Structure formats: structure tokens, C-alpha cells
Design a protein around this ligand. Structure first.
Ligand SMILES: C[C@H](NC(=O)c1ccc(F)c(F)c1)c1cn([C@@H](CC(=O)NO)Cc2ccc3c(c2)CCCC3)nn1
Ligand SMILES: C[C@H](NC(=O)c1ccc(F)c(F)c1)c1cn([C@@H](CC(=O)NO)Cc2ccc3c(c2)CCCC3)nn1
Ligand SMILES: [Zn+2]
Ligand SMILES: [Zn+2]
Lengths: 960, 957
């Protein structure tokens, strides 16, 4: 007997293919109006999520109003006919453990939120109106244009945004690819006013012309059953009108003939030296079951023995390489090979590019290789079998995007499983990687003064030149180069995926299973996820890692040199799902090994062995030391607010070597000096480790002792004394004090500010006063300081934790000068006093429950659990049950508790107010609305050292 | 003319740089008297020396002479209030001491200059009519007993008494002179002796005016001083006592050619060689024994020590005449011993006689005697002006030995060469006349004798006459040579003229990334001398125990290497000290400015280019290992103070940490260490004395250039010049740290009440309170309750923080000591309510005088400034501004300061206690308050992390 058809549903999909380890339940369907839908039922999830991706983006901006898609994206957050309160949507999310975001790309506008699972329907309802009845209020439009301006302004002096738009500006100007997608105040307000455009009508036109149900995919994840999710989606989205909008296509490449064989010389903001090589290629999207693009990218971008990178690195010309297909838009794609340049490299660009064509020629000579394809197919197959479970918010967004590109039943698998070996397609793409189709760009300060063009939106300085035919023909005649061998079988590919059974003594939290003078080992066998993976975390302590700038530099260079040496060997492991990380700290070194447990002990042994017996190559030492010098100078070009956060760290930590000190102590680092440093650093160590995953207690002790034994045999390591294991303390500000430290950012023409109200050492009590207060002000501060007052795109509030201390911190990047932003944050604080007093007890309990849901959100993947434990270990608080006990305590707080807290610690007139403010001035600066209170005269910090010496130092928190 | 004065001495010969006025005189009762007029002195002083001592003790009451000396402090017929002598002094910026040798008892004090008469009056009565009160006599016996106890386990006192016990038992030299509760109470009681009668009898029999010298220093004119001393001292009864003599030597012929093996407390290895010799004191104008000690004890090239050091047997040597008593003396040669030296004592002594035999062959050398004569002359001419209290005490002692007009010069100004006396003394220094003692822990378990008084374990054997004869036949050794003409003798004593912009305090005359240079040309003393002070700051001097061990060994090895070269200079009045610190290195060069640049450059150059001798490094490393262990045998109160310091400082390595880490110091490791250490540095310096601003800049530049050329030194960053903070204790806190001393059977305690950071107000609150309780605390805890011999109260200053501290070493357990200190604090609270406003103001003036007491020699003015400089406060005018503030304080300010910071119920009390238990100890009266349950510290690291740290003090200018 035949089924009863729901008319709001054009069709239900067949089984949506999923990983057998995926316990979430799935159903795909297409509504009658053509919205594509994936429903995800996960009865355990603490947060629900929904995303909608409109298949329309910046390439459809009208030509006379650049950035209209983007501006529209913003205005949809700001009120609808059925929910006219401008911040209804944000407020609702914030008060139910929710958040939201959206982005506009060239062909997609993607909106998504997450929310407590008991409020999916109410959040989805406010959300759906975005697509039915936006208000596009005039006052709202006149304000929000400033957020978009300010967003563009953060990017203006950023080299990646500059190069991104410069590529677009050197192709066919008549092509939509050349459009400027962000928008700014000029293109969205001032130019439109000179031209008599009514921008609220243009929003109304775009929304109506393009927000059509046939260009829309929707994803909803919640606790509810698939059948209840279907009704909910049908109820809310069936009424989006279908205007059968044809999907935009761009079949003519933006790089035609006159744009090939070109050479661009670009001046950067930071002192960086990069080489970019680009070939136009056909759109490979429809070939997703073979992925010829990625086959070639895997080979050309290989970093192992025989690779292209390995030879350019032996030559001293490049340190890093990226290679593979780059997205374009429906109808055109690119294939890139970008490398960074040593000083010599910059003088051998022509030979670098010859070597790239020699490697490409090697691939033509050998032809396509099914076994190579077999390796990629098998690796992708295991990655997908054992994919980590995702946070719902990111996941709904990702899938909404790709419902546009794949049959319902394949949305989950299409971007992972390979099925077809297509040597024809591999040849096809390979034939386009030829000198006659190349574009070359060189980014170096060395072109300062020698450019004759200016890209209009960012101000990028560059020159354009035809590549000489003599050069092209030299490249077309690339013979073979015997240093180039294809890769061999990847021995690191794992094969033991067995999940060891849970030992009869396994523990809900990590256990201290070894406590010696040398090593403190924490262990936990995975009892939640059951994937064949493990995380091995090691903190190494040495007093000599941070004793003075010169030593800090040497501890950096040692790990950079070490990683550089291991890189060819470890690349095989990285492709095989086994990755590691090694970075110096203010206490020593951090080593982290992550992924499939099978072959982890092999890689870990190679790393420790290298550490203990390292032979520096002086050619590599000189190159990496020069790159490090640059890195430190380049900090000058980070964001104003990033600077502000950096200076605050320097002020409030007992010891802190500044970039400039580091830079001044980098000159006296000689190879002999470093050679002596390493054995010294390794001579006395303490190791504290977390091992957590698909391993037994016996394996983990063996792993730890393996590390110890290796250090002992080769570096003669002996234990540090307990009295040497000191951590740095935080500065203790005086009751009623207010210090301001002022610097200038000499690159960006916005200011930044951080405001820190230090409260007290961390304890259950103080932690939850601060956190609940921060929940209560979170949305209102964003809505006041950014949506209503439009102080800047970047506006943040929340807790600030360091060295066992804590407080509340505001961060803002803005047009306006720091003293003004201070007023406005202060004006805002006063108004919260009255709001919290007038809040009903039901609303107050609502904020408690929001915080509670957020804190008891349980991690979805192993590495997220590992990091929760690692934080407890690094902070030496070891409070692994923290979440249950702090939430239990939260639930007993009263609004009078919070008001007493605010009036004791935060209020302007508060007897224990501790306030320090970093002011970062914009490049060009000089040293109605609610009432800002009156502020004391602030003590200006002129010398960080004297400031610290004159104040006490907090204790360090007591362990658990 | 005057009947009270027998005789009035002629001009007393003085140095032409001495601006003091002298008058000598003999009283009619035979008291010899020197009067000293110095109208600038802030403290006046007096001293009386009686030529009677322990050697005259009754044979049945060992220690009576010493016991008597204590008793004289405890009241007279005219001033019967027991503590009246000390209390008067304490309330008038004054102090006092006394000691008993074998033939002298020496009493002295100092006091505010406006109160000499009142002080001297109460002092005089000690020699007229002591009360020898029975109650006081039964209390003070305990102070003398615990004075002996602190010595019992001290290796210097054991050997001192053991030599005495190995002489002729019938000679007074063998007497135990300290006495203890057994000899001064328990045995006399059991034997029927009335100790009070015995004291009275000894005092009337021997405290005779004919055996006394008196020195008095004041602002008064010489005439007024004459009348004052006559008023107070001519009353003294003259019983014409014969000066005791001891013509027979305590070592007779059965005591010679004797060998002694002695077990120490500390791990120390020592060789003592002694010869008896006639009393040389009558020969003082030619000083034969000192001529010979100059040579036998020389440390320069060709010397006896130089060869014993180069064979790796000995590290230090002392030789010369050692005092005995009227009748007998000794000549000594004492060396310490390496591990090898211990196995070669026979050859060490053979080398000794080889060197003596050379001196017999060459015969006396007048040019040597002449060089001593000329150096001593320079020494006396430019002698630093002495402290009043120590000066009167010294002179009163020597007035017995020299004519009045020459008492200042007798010990300095040699007359004519008497080679016959030299050959006479030399003739006694022969194997048949030797006594030999070895001290090593290698004799543990191999001894058979026990010294009575201290318990010392030892063995006595004869030296085999085969060994005597080998020493008798000691050939000449080519390695020995007389010293050369001292090329460091100063010859330019010109005082540079005051520069026209010279400053009264040191001035910051250079301020680079590498050097802060503080300079002051001397404007007070105008002697041809300069003090040169350098702090070398490096973060690698103390980063970890291994690095601290290497900074120590570096400086020891460097001093060791410089020693022969630097001996000449030291003989010529030019000396240096070179010490590792927790921030780097301290170098001081003091003395005649003439050849200072020569020495300083040699030191800085040896630093920057040092080549370690592997054999020295082994030997000095082993010595260092030993001194770290030997800390176990220091005294309990010394342990107390050390733990407190290892708990209130941010960073501090323990002896056990340094000791473990020592095995990891290798010669290669140390070679790598030094250049690193020197690679980065910051130099802060004080140059002060007979030098110009341009000369100073040139010394500082010489130091920088030598470092920069040979060691590639570069400046440190300002942000690296960090100093350690003190632990900040919690309001109402009480912490207790407990340790055991394994060696002494006494306990120690330090009690620290941390107040606040140093500040003009907090400094003078604390100092005034200390002043007010100083005497009451000593009187209560020592005189009256007899807790122990060592009882101290005062300020503690460390790392910019300060408080009040009590230190006590006692037989009683430390918790008991804690309650008695708490009891004292309560009773002080009543005392201060009751105290009249005049008594309060006396305490204010007393502290004022002390703080404003200006310094008398260059070294002491230098130190006052150096304290400002290493403390980074730079408050060179501190005394005037602080004393001004002090005068504004009221009794009420002090009471509230007490009630807020110190009282048992104070809201801001911060109390830490270190309890050092005696070896065998276990873990009416005014009433002690009730105390909280002290937080017990088990771990210094944890203790620290859990508390805040104070700030540092801001500089002044
Ligand atoms: C992630 C971040 N939200 C917050 O930090 C935040 C924190 C607490 C709150 F209570 C709250 F409402 C927001 C964010 C995302 N976007 C924009 C992303 C983007 O740039 N599309 O082009 C999207 C956007 C555009 C306009 C508006 C909002 C969000 C929020 C309501 C006000 C107007 N801007 N900021
Ligand atoms: C130098 C030290 N004085 C103090 O600490 C001190 C501090 C502040 C005062 F207010 C005070 F009265 C004493 C010291 C010297 N001696 C003795 C030195 C020694 O042992 N000869 O054989 C001499 C001695 C013998 C007995 C007595 C006193 C002094 C003082 C009065 C009580 C009885 N004992 N203690
Ligand atoms: Zn945006
Ligand atoms: Zn005594």
C-alpha cells in the first residue's frame, strides 16, 4: 500500500551514509519550495544548532554598491516584523547558552547559531524570520554600516587581505571575481548618497531577488526525534517563497590570455618574503569521487624524502611550501605552489620556478599511479571511520554549505571518500601546469620604492611585468632532475585500530600513576569515545629556558631547529593521522603527540632521541635565526587590540622578556653558544605529563620511562630539586588604584584598549561571582558598546585568568581614542547596577541556567577532554571535578550576592577596585548618550620594571 | 702640689694626625691613669684594667676571678639597684662589657658625652664596695654556666684548655678559668665553701689600687678630667699587692718531645707545633719574637708556607710568639692539613726545621728589622682614629707595661736591633724542645684519654728519638729564601686638596648601562687612604645550587692564586676582600692610596683571565665540602637565624642543596662557568677617600676596560637587575619551623614579629620601641630569669622589610622560651603606660645620640654609604631626617604602634618562630598569655608559594 504524501515535502531521502562510529541519526529531505534539508538527531547533545546557507554571495553584489551581500548579512541580525526588538535574536541566544555567527563568501551567505537544547524551537523561530521579514530599520542601517567599515579597517593593513584582493584586481576587471566583497562606509553609505541610491530599498531588492527558497539549504541538530525535527522545519520554513532564481555561474576564467605569463612585485606590511605561483584550471568540483586536484597537490606539496620542498630547502632557498588546488567559484579554479623565501631564495626566484617545473615534469614522465591513489583512498577512509565527533554549531554550518553540492545521501561522505581512479583527469589537470599558463608574484620589502601601481581598496603597492619569453622557454625545457623521486609507501599508515578493553581499575578522571623527582605522570584510559587514538602531553621544566632573554632565544631556536630537522621524517606520519607539536615556554618546553595510537611510540622515540643528541646544521641555524629576527620585528604589525593584550601580560607577570629585549639578545646567539646551551638545558629537568587515550596504564608507564631513559642515556639528565619548581606570580594591585600604560601602534590606524579589573585569587566562590556577572553583562555590553554606540567591530567582555588570579576584562578596537572608550565602558557599568537590581528572580535564575549549561557541556572529542585536564595540570590546580562543584555552587548564588560582589570589587566607587588599563594609540593619534561617571586621576606607568618592583606579588593557588 | 696626684706625666707622645689631647698621671694610691680630651666625640668612655686574673684563682674555686667580674655589674653599696649600671647606660646611649684573662680583668663602657660623670660614678663603685648580693650570686652563676656551655663543643676552646691540661698540673696555667655551675656552686656547696665570702676575700685582697690602670675619654678639658678621676678613684684602697709571677715554665722536660692526637667536633685537620720560650716582654723595644714570626710566618715567595702549599700538604700557616704569662711564652707554628698533609706530618715538621735551620745559617738580618720598624712607623702615624670604647679598654690594659709618655707608641715604635736576642729565641726552636698536636677525625676510636673540662678525646705518645734526630739533622732546603724588599711599601702620603665641587655625600658621577659609580673625596679624616667597593651583579651567580657552588669556588681559587703576590701589599697596609654574594661578587680594596691601582689591576686581570690549577681545585673543593657539613656544629642560635633566613627570602639554597650539587662540579664545568658568569655584568661601585673625581672615573674605566678586553663583558638589561623580596605574612599569623641541632645540648629560638616595609615612620617606631625594651628585655630574660647566656632583642632588617626580633640560646625548650618572651611583652605594656614623660624623652635622646654618632675612620663612613648603595635606597642623609622625625614621636604613637603591630591581640601581628632543639631534647613568674595553635611549616617551598611577597623600597635620589 502506497504512502500518504505530505505536500510541504517534495521528497525524503534514502539512508544518509555515515561512519559506523557515528551514533547521531540522520534524515535528508527537500521541501516543496526546494529548500534542501538535513535533520540531525542526537539525544545526548546539550546544545542544539541550526544553520542556513543561501547560495548567494559577494559575486552577486550590484556593481554600483560593493559589499551589499555582506551588509545584508549584518542587517538580518537586527530585527524582523515578528520579532522587532533589535537584539531579540542575540539576547535570546545569550540567555540560553547560545551564540551565533554568519559569514559572506563569494557564492554563499551562511548563518548559524547554537542554543541550549531546551530552546531550539524558540531560537529557530527568531532565526527563520531572517528569511521572511527583515525590518532593515533606517536607524539600524545607519549604525551597523560602522561595524562593517571597522571590519574592513582591521583588514586594511593585513598582508593576507591585501594579497587576497590584489589577485582579484589583476584579473579581468569586467568579471565579478574582481569585486570587493567586504564593503565599507564609502561603498555602502557615502558614495550611495552622492548617487541618490536609497540603500534600504536596495537591501529590500536583494533580499527579495536572491533570498529564494530554491537557493537555500538548512541543517538542524537537536535532541528531538527525526520526525519531530521534520515537522518543526516544515512549520518554520515552508513559507519562504520560491522565486526559481537561477544559480549564478561563472564559466569564463577571470584570468584570460593577457593575464598569463605575468609577474607581480608586491610590497608587504610585515618584513616577509614570499613567492606565489598560480595556474588557472577548470572547475574540478564535479569530479569529487576522484579528486585529481588533490592527487597532484599531495605529490607537488609533499615534504618528505625526494620531494620538491626537500630540494629547495637543501639549496637554502625556501623553508615552507604549499601546493594544490585553490577554490574559485562555480566555473573556475586555481592550482597554486606558494613558498617562502630565504634571503638567497629571493635572488633565485627564476631557479626556484625552474625546479618546480622539473618536478612537474617528473610527474608527467612517470604517469598517474594507482597505488598513490590507493594510499589516499585508504587514509581518507580511516579518517572518516574514526572522525572525531564535531561541536554542533560548526557542524550544522559546514553541512549547510555542502548540501548545495552533493546528493542528500552523500553530504556526510562526499568530501572524504574517494571511489574512482581517474588517470585521465589526473593528466588533464597536469597538462595545465605549464609555463604558458603561469602567474608569478613576489612579496618582498626589497621592492619598496620600485612600484608604479596602487590597488584601490587596500593601497597595496606593486608593479606588473610580462615574464620574458627567454624565461618561459627555459622553463618549458625543464629536463629531469635526479634529486626528485616520488614518495614511497607511507610506513606510518596505521593498521591496529583495536580498542583495548577498559581495565578493572580505570578512573573517571586522570590519575597520578608516577611521582618521582624526575617525572610526574598523569594517566587516563579513554572511557567515552572509543576511537583508536591517544594524546601524549609533556611539560619539561628547566630554570634555564627563561633565565634571561638570551636563553629564551636559544630555547626558541633549539626547538625551531629540531622541528626543521625532523620535518621530512615526520611528514609521512602527519599524512597518516599522527602529528606532534614542540614549542618553548616560560618554564621550558611543551611536547604534544596526537592521533592514531598504533605507531605513536615510534614517533615519540624519534623525537626524544633527536632532542638529546641534536647536531645543529649551521646553514639551517643561520636561516632560522634570520627568520626569527624578522618574526620579532613583525610583531609591530599585529592588531592594536592584540598589542594591548600583550602589554597587559608583560605588566602583570613577575618576569617577561619583551620582543625588543629578545630582539636585542638575538644578536649575541652564536652557533657555539647554542651548542653549549642545549646540554645545559637538558642537564636538570622535571617532566610532568598527561597520557590519555586508547592506551593501558602499562603502556603509559612504558612511554613515560622511555622518555626518561632516553634523556638520561644521551643527555645525562638528572632531576631538578623541588625548591626550583617555582611558577611566576601575578602583580597585586592596590585597593582603589588605577594604572594606565600607553603605547602606540605604528601600523594600524585604529586604537586598541584592554581594561582589567582584577578581583582576587581563584577559588570556587570568586570564580563563580565573576563568571555569573560576566554572563549577565555579556550581551548587554556587546549590544551597548558595539551595536548601539558603534565603538568598533572588535568588542569583548569576559573573565581574564592568569597565574591563579582573575578579573573582568573589556577589549575594544576602535576609531576613537582610548580615554573615550574608558568613559563608555564606565558609563555602561553603571547602567548594569540598575538592570541587575530590577531583574526578576526568574530572569536571574535564567542566567544561572545559561552559565550552568555552558560549564557542564561535555566534550565531544578526545582532544577536547585532554585539554580540559591539561589546563588543570598546567595551572597546578589539579581540580578535575571542577565543573560539577562550581556549577553546584553557582546554583546557590543570589542576585544580592552578585550585587555585593559588584559593589565591593567592580563599581567605580568600590573599596577594593583594582583597575589597570592598556591604551594602544592608533598610528596617527596624539597623546543623548548615558552619563560616564567621573574617574580618579590615573597613575601612568612609564617603566614596567619600576611598576612591578613597587607592588606586592600574589601567592600561587594551592593544589587540590 | 696636689696630694692626690703622685706624679703628672710629660707630653704623651702621639701621632701628629691624632687631634685628641692626652695627659698621663699616677694617683697617690698607685693607680696609673691616662686622660683623653676630644671635644668632638659623641660618646665618652672609660675603662679600668686590674692586673689580676684567672691564674690567681683559688685552687679550690676554678673561675672565681671570672665569676667576680660578672658580679660587679649587679650592684654596689651606693647604687644598690641591681641593674642600675646597665639601665643608666641604656638610657644614655651607652653600652658596656668586661673580660677576664689569666692576668687581667678589664672593664669598660661608653655613654652619651653629656653624661660621663654619672656613668663614671656608678662604674667606680665596682672597685670600692660591690654588694655581691646572695640572690644575684645564685642567679648569675647560671649565666656563667651557659657561657661555658656555648664553648664546650667549640673546637677552639677545647684545644685551648687541652694544651693547659697537658702541661705541669702543679702550675696555675693548667687551671680552668671560665668556671661553671659545678666549680662555682655544686662543688663549693658540697665542700662547705661560702662562695660569697670567697668573692669578698678575693676582691679585698687583689682589687688593689696599685694594680689598676684607668683610661677616661670625654669632651671635658684635661683639667676637668683630672679633677673628675681624682674625685672618684683616689678613694680606692691600696694594699700594695705584689704582681704575681710565674718564672717556672708550665712545660718541663717530661712535657717536651710529646705528640698529641686529638679528635675534633667539626671535620677539621690541623697541626700545632709549640716551643716554650722565656718571657720576651722586657725586650719589647727590639721585639725578637715578632722578627722571627715575621719570617717563619711569611706567605710570600720562598716562604715555608709556599713550599708546604706547593707540595699540597698545607693551605694556611701561622707562626710567631704567643703570650703565656709573666714568666713564660710560646713560639707556635700552626698549619691546617689537606688529606695528603695528614699522611705527611713528619715531613711537614722536617720542612719547618729546615727553614729554622736556614735562619740559623744566614744569621739575623738588620735590613729586615729595619723594614718592620719603618712600616710600623707609617702604621702608627696614619692609624685610623679608634672607637672610644675599644680605645680606652686597650690602653688601660697596656698602661701596666709601658711608661706613660710612651704608652701610645710602645707597641708600634721599635728601637734598636738586638740580634743577640733573636739568636737567643732561635736557640729554643729545636726538636728537643717541641710539642706536636694533630687534630683529625681519623683518630675517632683510636684514643685513650679524656680531658676533664670539655671531654676532648685524645691520645698522648712520645715522639720517637729516631724522629727527633731526623729533625735535628735537617739539611738546608734550596726552596727556602728570605723575603725580598717589600715593593708595596707606600711612599706618597700627599693628601690631595679638596676639589672645588667636592660633595659631603657620595655623588653619582657615572651612570651607564654597565656602571653606576658613586664617588666622594674624603672631607673628614685626611689620611692617605682610600676604600674601593665594587658589586659585580650577574644572574648566574645564584640561579641554582650548582651555579652558587661555582661562584664560591671561583673566588676561593682566585684568592688562593693571588695570595703570595698580595701578601707584600697586606704587610704594606693594602688589603682586599673578594666574596661571592647572592647577586654576584663583592670586591673591596682598602688602604694606602699610593699603590692601590697596581693591586686592583692585578685582581681584575686575574679575574678576567683565570687559569685553574687542577690540584688547587681538588683541594679547595674538598675544603668547601667540609665547611658545608661543618655547619652542623654551629650553635643553636646560629641555626635559628639561618633557618629564618631560609624561610623569609624569595630564593635561598640550603646547605644540603649546595652539598649535593657539589659532586656535580667538575674542573671542565667550572672552566665553562667563569666566562659565562663574566659575559654579562653590571658594576655598582663606591670609591671614597684620598682621590679626585678624575681619578675615580679612571679606576672605574680601568675595571670596565679589563673586563671588556679579556672577558667580552656586556651590560645587563635594567629589567634583569632584580632583587629578592621577603615573604609577606598574614594578619594574625603564627608560623613555627622546627629543626634539631645534633651537636650542642642547648636549644635556640629566633622570634620575628614582621611589622612593615621600611619607611621613615615605620623605621623610627621600630627603633624607638627596641630602645625602650632593650635593657628591660636583657634584664628580664637574662639577668632575672636566667634563660641563657645569649639573649638578644632588636630590629631585623631584610630585603626592605623589617620587624622586631628576639634571639635566645638556652637549656630550656623553645616552646618555654616562647612563652617567657610573650610574658615579657605584656609586662612591657604596663611599663610603657607607667613611664613618665621624662623617661620617654631620655629614650628618645638616647636613640638620637646613637643614630647621629658620626664615624671616626674612613672604613666606617664608607660602610654607612655602602649600606645605602647595596640596599638600593641611597638615602645618604638618612640619619638627620630620621632623627628629626624621631623627636616628634610621642609615647602615645608608640603605644598604638605596639597595640596594632606587636601585642598578642594585635590586628596586624605577623609572627614567625624558628625552634632549634638541643641534641637530646623532645618535640612567682609573670604569667604568659594564651597562644593560638601555630601553623607548623613542614616545607619551605610550599610555605612560600602560599603567601604574598612584599614590594621593594623605592630609591631616594
Ligand atoms: C562572534 C561575534 N559575536 C560576539 O562577539 C557576541 C558576543 C556576545 C553577544 F551577546 C553577542 F550578541 C555577540 C560576531 C559575529 N559577527 C558578525 C560576523 C560577520 O562578520 N559577518 O560578516 C555577524 C553579526 C553581525 C551583526 C551583529 C551580530 C553578529 C550580533 C548582534 C549585533 C549585530 N560579529 N561579531
Ligand atoms: C655585651 C653584652 N651585653 C648585652 O647584650 C646587653 C644589652 C643591653 C643591655 F641593656 C644590657 F644590660 C646588656 C654582654 C656582656 N656580657 C659579659 C661579657 C662576659 O661574658 N664577660 O666574662 C659582661 C656582663 C656580665 C654580667 C652582667 C652584664 C654584663 C650586664 C648587666 C647584667 C649582668 N654579657 N653580656
Ligand atoms: Zn561582517
Ligand atoms: Zn663571662
Amino acid at each position: 500500500g502506497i504512502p500518504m504524501n505530505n505536500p510541504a515535502i517534495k521528497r525524503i531521502g534514502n539512508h544518509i551514509t555515515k561512519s559506523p562510529e557515528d551514533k547521531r541519526e540522520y534524515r535528508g529531505l527537500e521541501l516543496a519550495n526546494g529548500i534542501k534539508v538535513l535533520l540531525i538527531s542526537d539525544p545526548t547533545t546539550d546544545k542544539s544548532s541550526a544553520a542556513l546557507d543561501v547560495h548567494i554571495g559577494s559575486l552577486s553584489d550590484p556593481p554600483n554598491i560593493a559589499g551589499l551581500s555582506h551588509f545584508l548579512e549584518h542587517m538580518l541580525f537586527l530585527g524582523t516584523k515578528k520579532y522587532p526588538k533589535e537584539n531579540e535574536y542575540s539576547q535570546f541566544l545569550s540567555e540560553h547558552a547560545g551564540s551565533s555567527n554568519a559569514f559572506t563568501s563569494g557564492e554563499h551567505t551562511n548563518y548559524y547559531f547554537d542554543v541550549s537544547h531546551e530552546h531550539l524551537e524558540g531560537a529557530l523561530d527568531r532565526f527563520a524570520q531572517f528569511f521572511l521579514s527583515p525590518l532593515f530599520d533606517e536607524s539600524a542601517k545607519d549604525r551597523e554600516v560602522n561595524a562593517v567599515d571597522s571590519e574592513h579597517e582591521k583588514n586594511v593593513m593585513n598582508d593576507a587581505w591585501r594579497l587576497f584582493q590584489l589577485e582579484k584586481a589583476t584579473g579581468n576587471p569586467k568579471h565579478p571575481f574582481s569585486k570587493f566583497g567586504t564593503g565599507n562606509k564609502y561603498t555602502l553609505e557615502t558614495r550611495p548618497n552622492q548617487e541618490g541610491i536609497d540603500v534600504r530599498q536596495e537591501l529590500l531588492k536583494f533580499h527579495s531577488a536572491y533570498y529564494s527558497s530554491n537557493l537555500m539549504a538548512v541543517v538542524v541538530l537537536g535532541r528531538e526525534s527525526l520526525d519531530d525535527l521534520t515537522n518543526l522545519v516544515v512549520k518554520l520554513f515552508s513559507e519562504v517563497e520560491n522565486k526559481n532564481v537561477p544559480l549564478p555561474e561563472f564559466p569564463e576564467h577571470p584570468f584570460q590570455e593577457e593575464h598569463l605569463k605575468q609577474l607581480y612585485k608586491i610590497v608587504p606590511i610585515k618584513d616577509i618574503r614570499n613567492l606565489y605561483v598560480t595556474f588557472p584550471i577548470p572547475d574540478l568540483q564535479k569530479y569529487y569521487k576522484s579528486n585529481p586536484g588533490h592527487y597532484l597537490g599531495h605529490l607537488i606539496g609533499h615534504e618528505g624524502p625526494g620531494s620538491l620542498l626537500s630540494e629547495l630547502k637543501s639549496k637554502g632557498w625556501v623553508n615552507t611550501l604549499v601546493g594544490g588546488q585553490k577554490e574559485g567559484a562555480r566555473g573556475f579554479m586555481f592550482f597554486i605552489i606558494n613558498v617562502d623565501l630565504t634571503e638567497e631564495g629571493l635572488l633565485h626566484v627564476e631557479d626556484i620556478i625552474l625546479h618546480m617545473f622539473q618536478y612537474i615534469q617528473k610527474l608527467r614522465a612517470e604517469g598517474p599511479q594507482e597505488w598513490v591513489f590507493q594510499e589516499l583512498k585508504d587514509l581518507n577512509a580511516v579518517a572518516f571511520r574514526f572522525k572525531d565527533k564535531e561541536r554542533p554549531r560548526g557542524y550544522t554550518s559546514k553541512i549547510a554549505g555542502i548540501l548545495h553540492y552533493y546528493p542528500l545521501e552523500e553530504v556526510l561522505t562526499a568530501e572524504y571518500l574517494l571511489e574512482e581512479f581517474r588517470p585521465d583527469l589526473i593528466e588533464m589537470v597536469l597538462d595545465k601546469l605549464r609555463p604558458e599558463n603561469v602567474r608569478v608574484a613576489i612579496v618582498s620589502k626589497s621592492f619598496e620604492g620600485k612600484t608604479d601601481r596602487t590597488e584601490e581598496w587596500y593601497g597595496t603597492q606593486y608593479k606588473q611585468e610580462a615574464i620574458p619569453d627567454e624565461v618561459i622557454k627555459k622553463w618549458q625545457n625543464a629536463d629531469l632532475n635526479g634529486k626528485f623521486k616520488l614518495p614511497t609507501k607511507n610506513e606510518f599508515i596505521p593498521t591496529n585500530f583495536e580498542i583495548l578493553p577498559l581495565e578493572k581499575e580505570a578512573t573517571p578522571y586522570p590519575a597520578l600513576i608516577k611521582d618521582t623527582a624526575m617525572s610526574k605522570l598523569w594517566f587516563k584510559q579513554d572511557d567515552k569515545f572509543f576511537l583508536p587514538k591517544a594524546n601524549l602531553n609533556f611539560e619539561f621544566f628547566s630554570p634555564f629556558a627563561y633565565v634571561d632573554p638570551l636563553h629564551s632565544n636559544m630555547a626558541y631556536l633549539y626547538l625551531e631547529l629540531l622541528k626543521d630537522s625532523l620535518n621530512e621524517y615526520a611528514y609521512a606520519a602527519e599524512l597518516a593521522g599522527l602529528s606532534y607539536d614542540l614549542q618553548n615556554t616560560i618554564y621550558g618546553m611543551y611536547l604534544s603527540v596526537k592521533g592514531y595510537n598504533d605507531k605513536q611510540p615510534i614517533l615519540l622515540k624519534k623525537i626524544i632521541e633527536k632532542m638529546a643528541t641534536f647536531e645543529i646544521d649551521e646553514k639551517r641555524f643561520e636561516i632560522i635565526k634570520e627568520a626569527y629576527m624578522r618574526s620579532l620585528n613583525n610583531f609591530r604589525a599585529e592588531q592594536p587590540h592584540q598589542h594591548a593584550m600583550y602589554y597587559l601580560r608583560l605588566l602583570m607577570t613577575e618576569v617577561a622578556w619583551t620582543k625588543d629585549e629578545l630582539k636585542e639578545a638575538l644578536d649575541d646567539v652564536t652557533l657555539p653558544r647554542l651548542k653549549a646551551f642545549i646540554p645545559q638545558l637538558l642537564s636538570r629537568l622535571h617532566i610532568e605529563a598527561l597520557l590519555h587515550g586508547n592506551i593501558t596504564k602499562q603502556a603509559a608507564l612504558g612511554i613515560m620511562q622511555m622518555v626518561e631513559d632516553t634523556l638520561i642515556e644521551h643527555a645525562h639528565t638528572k632531576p631538578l630539586l623541588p625548591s626550583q619548581l617555582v611558577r611566576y606570580r601575578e602583580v597585586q594591585l592596590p585597593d582603589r588604584g588605577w594604572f594606565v600604560y600607553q603605547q602606540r601602534n605604528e601600523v594600524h590606524n585604529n586604537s586598541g584598549i584592554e581594561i582589567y579589573y582584577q578581583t582576587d585569587m581563584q577559588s570556587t566562590s570568586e570564580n563563580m561571582f565573576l563568571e555569573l556577572f560576566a554572563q549577565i553583562i555579556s550581551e548587554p555590553a556587546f549590544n551597548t558598546l558595539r551595536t548601539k554606540e558603534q565603538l568598533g567591530y572588535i568588542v569583548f567582555s569576559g573573565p581574564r585568568r592568569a597565574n591563579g588570579i582573575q578579573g573582568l576584562r573589556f577589549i575594544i578596537q576602535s576609531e576613537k581614542p582610548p580615554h573615550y572608550l574608558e568613559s563608555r565602558v564606565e558609563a555602561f557599568l553603571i547602567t548594569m547596577e540598575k538592570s541587575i537590581e530590577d531583574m526578576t528572580e526568574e530572569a536571574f535564575q535564567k542566567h544561572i541556567q545559561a552559565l550552568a549549561i555552558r560549564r557542564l557541556d561535555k566534550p565531544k572529542k578526545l582532544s577536547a577532554e585532554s585539554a580540559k585536564y591539561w589546563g588543570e595540570i598546567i595551572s597546578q590546580q589539579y581540580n578535575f571535578d571542577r565543573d560539577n562543584t562550581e556549577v553546584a555552587y553557582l546554583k546557590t548564588l543570589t542576585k544580592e550576592d552578585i550585587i555585593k560582589f559588584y559593589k565591593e570589587m567592580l563599581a567605580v566607587d568600590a573599596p577594593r577596585r583594582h583597575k589597570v588599563s592598556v591604551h594602544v594609540l592608533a598610528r596617527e593619534m596624539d597623546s543623548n548618550l548615558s552619563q560616564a561617571p567621573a574617574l580618579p586621576q590615573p597613575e601612568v606607568i612609564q617603566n614596567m620594571t619600576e611598576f612591578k618592583r613597587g607592588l606586592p606579588l600574589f601567592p600561587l593557588v594551592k593544589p587540590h
